[PDB]
Structures are given as C-alpha cells and as structure tokens.
Write a protein that binds this DNA or RNA. Structure first.
Ligand code: NA
Ligand code: NA
Ligand code: NA
Ligand code: NA
Length: 331
DNA sequence: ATGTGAGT
DNA sequence: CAAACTCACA
C-alpha cells in the first residue's frame, strides 16, 4: 500500500520540469502538453522503467521522450535539463513567478528588461500592477507558514464580525486548517446567507458588507481582487499596542448559494485524496459529487437533478457513509 | 458576446 | 486534480 509510485519519480520529475520550462520559458504549448501527459501516464506505470523503449510502449510516450529516458537512465541526468537548471534566464523567470500576481507572461517581460531579483523589483515598482505590488510588498510574509493558534485567532474575528452583521450568515474556514493541520499558508473562507440561493436575485452586497466591516476593524488591509461573489486580499492580526507586528496573510472570501454551500465546504475542506475516495464511493452508489452538487445517476450512467443538501452530514447520508470528521479526512 | 493573464 | 471559474486590466 501502494498507493502511489514512487517507482519512476526520477523520470516523472524530469518530464514535469521539462514541461514547466517549455510552457513558461519557451512559449511552446504543445511541448508542454506532451511532457505533461507523458509524465502522467508514466506515473501510473506499476513497473520500474529500465529503458526508453519500455516507456515508448505507453500512449503519450514518443521517440523523443524515450531517448531522453535512455540518457537519464544511462547517466543519472539529462544534459538538456542540467542546462535549463543552470540557465540564468529560466531561473530568474521561476523566481519572479513566486510573487503573487506575477506569472510567466509578466516574468518573461521583466527578465527581458533585466529585472530578476526582489531588489530589482523593489526598484521597478512602476513596471507592476496593484496585485503584483501587493505581492511584492509582502513577498516574505506570503511564503511564511501560518501557525494554527494564529489561524484560530483569525477564525474568530471573521466569524465574530460576520455574526454581529447578521446571524443568518454562515461562514466557514475550510482547507487543511479545518481538517486540523498544525499550519496553513492561507485562510480560505466560504460564506453564505439564506436569501442567496442558486435561483435567487443574487444580491451582491452580501459579500461586500462583510469585506467592508473587516477593513473597518483593520483585519483586512489590502485588496487583490473583489467581485460580487469572490474576494482575495490581505489580512493581519491586531498587534499588541506597540511591539511585534504580525505578518500579513493571504485570505480569500467566497460567497456561495445556500443550497450549494455544504458541497463547497465539503469539497474545499478536502483532502484531495479523501475527495477522490468519496466521489469514487459515490459513483459506486450511483451518485456524482462535485463542488456544487450531489446528483443521482441513471440507468444509462447519466443523471442529474441536484439533491437537497443543508449539511455535510446529508451528503454522507446519500452515499450511505458514516459521517467523517474533517479531523479524519486525510484519505 | 473583448481577449488574456493570473489565481484558486 | 486538472479545469473551470472569477476578476483585473489593456
Ligand atoms: Na505563478
Ligand atoms: Na524608476
Ligand atoms: Na487553507
Ligand atoms: Na488555497
């Protein structure tokens, strides 16, 4: 058990790095696609590949990748990948990409202009948009881990402010934090209200009222993006008078229809492996579960009509599963 | 009925 | 989990 391999990680590591190079250093979408699928199919392969020709029999694996595998099998390396690794251009592109807001397109532009380091970026803030400038301002903070006792404190300020606005609101911090992790890198809040449903007249101000109120108490300090259903921004714990100021953190807040809430909470509580195991069991029972709904499945293996859900428990009830605590949703 | 770049 | 989905901006 077993579970995943583990058996050809060296090959698949090579191909994924090659894909990332071609996607976002070269502008070569087809090469990127081909490496990605070749990596994915090899990763499923239950035997330790001993030649390029053995890999070649797989669909997705052609002559060029088979030859790269020989070189990598024979030597312990691929010269082509050692050169990419040593390449200043590609390394600079990948570093700049760590800034939230900067992606391959803006990274290519910046490196072509000689912008490669944080210091370089901190001297050319006029080349960046608001998202990227906020990404840069807090670059160090946004790579920092977030202790659990911090997440909890963050939890009951957004939970409390939301209540004092209107007790009808339901807000939940999901992600690994919900499933019990000793640290996260981000806070992921799911928000809803009884008179926003998938059939209703929308009412955009549900999300804005809570965002505004969190800025008002100085929890939210910056905005990366903000629409009628989705907010992404920055928050901070209140510092103690003077002394140590807490690092700034990424927080997302998402408004979801009431009749779709618990499927979202379920889906964004994870974990990824749990989720896969759960939708797999659902299929065994004749149900399909996604982030929005759970639907029965018909004789022809296809049906719909969302089932009523006002609880995580309800989803479990339908697939005849004992309710699983988030605390034990690792697998 | 804008297209792309990003982030999740 | 990739894919689709939001949102920002040129
Ligand atoms: Na990125
Ligand atoms: Na300048
Ligand atoms: Na999280
Ligand atoms: Na996240």
């Amino acid at each position: 058990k077993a579970p995943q391999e583990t058996l050809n990680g060296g090959i698949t590591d090579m191909l994924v790095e090659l894909a990332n190079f071609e996607k976002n250093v070269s502008q070569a979408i087809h090469k990127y696609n081909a490496y990605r699928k070749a990596a994915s199919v090899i990763a499923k392969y239950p035997h330790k590949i001993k030649s390029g020709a053995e890999a070649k029999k797989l669909p997705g694996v052609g002559t060029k990748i088979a030859e790269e595998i020989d070189e990598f099998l024979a030597t312990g390396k691929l010269r082509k990948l050692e050169k990419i690794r040593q390449d200043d251009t590609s390394s600079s592109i990948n570093f700049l990409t760590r800034v939230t807001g900067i992606g391959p397109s803006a990274a290519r532009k910046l490196v072509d202009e000689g912008i490669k380091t944080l210091e370089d970026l901190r001297k050319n803030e006029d080349k960046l948009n608001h998202h990227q400038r906020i990404g840069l301002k807090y670059f160090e903070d946004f790579e920092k881990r977030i202790p659990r006792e911090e997440m909890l404190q963050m939890q009951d300020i957004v939970l409390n402010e939301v209540k004092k606005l209107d007790p009808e609101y339901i807000a939940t911090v999901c992600g690994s934090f919900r499933r019990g992790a000793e640290s996260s890198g981000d806070m992921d809040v799911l928000l809803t209200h009884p008179n926003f449903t998938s059939e209703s007249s929308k009412q955009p101000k549900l999300l804005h009222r809570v965002v505004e109120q969190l800025q008002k108490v100085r929890f939210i300090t910056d905005t990366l993006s903000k629409g009628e259903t989705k907010f992404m921004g920055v928050c901070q714990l209140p510092s103690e008078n003077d002394e140590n100021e807490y690092p700034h953190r990424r927080i997302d807040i998402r408004l979801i229809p009431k009749d779709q809430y618990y499927c979202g909470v379920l889906y964004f509580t994870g974990s990824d492996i749990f989720n896969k195991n759960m939708r797999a069991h659902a299929l065994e029972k004749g149900f399909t579960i996604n982030e929005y709904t759970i639907r029965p499945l018909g004789v022809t293996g296809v049906a719909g009509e969302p089932l009523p859900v006002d609880s995580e428990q309800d989803i479990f009830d339908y697939i005849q599963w004992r309710y699983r605590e988030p605390k034990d949703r690792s697998e």
